[PDB]
Amino acid sequence: KKWGWLAWVDPAYEFIKGFGKGAIKEGNKDKWKNI
């Protein structure tokens, strides 16, 4: 299996950690629903 999903999300999520370390509303809006 290719499994190139997590490979593309890996560098993605890590990006928001620095670019949007203080802006969950801009990205993860309805993230509370998954928690």
Coordinates of C-alpha atoms in Angstrom, one line a residue:
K1 CA 0.0 0.0 0.0
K2 CA 1.2 3.5 -0.9
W3 CA -0.1 5.1 2.3
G4 CA 0.9 8.6 1.2
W5 CA -1.7 10.2 3.4
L6 CA 0.2 10.5 6.7
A7 CA 3.3 11.3 4.7
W8 CA 1.6 14.5 3.3
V9 CA -0.1 15.3 6.6
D10 CA 3.2 14.9 8.6
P11 CA 4.8 18.0 7.2
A12 CA 1.5 19.7 7.1
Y13 CA 0.4 19.6 10.7
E14 CA 4.0 20.4 11.7
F15 CA 3.7 23.5 9.7
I16 CA 0.7 24.9 11.6
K17 CA 2.7 24.2 14.8
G18 CA 5.0 27.1 13.9
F19 CA 3.0 29.1 11.4
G20 CA -0.2 28.9 13.4
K21 CA 1.0 28.1 16.9
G22 CA -1.7 30.4 18.1
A23 CA -4.6 30.2 15.7
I24 CA -6.7 27.0 16.0
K25 CA -9.8 28.9 14.9
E26 CA -8.2 29.6 11.5
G27 CA -7.6 26.0 10.9
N28 CA -8.9 23.4 13.4
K29 CA -12.3 25.0 13.8
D30 CA -14.6 22.0 14.5
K31 CA -11.7 20.0 16.1
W32 CA -13.5 19.9 19.5
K33 CA -16.0 17.5 17.9
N34 CA -13.3 14.9 17.6
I35 CA -12.5 15.3 21.3

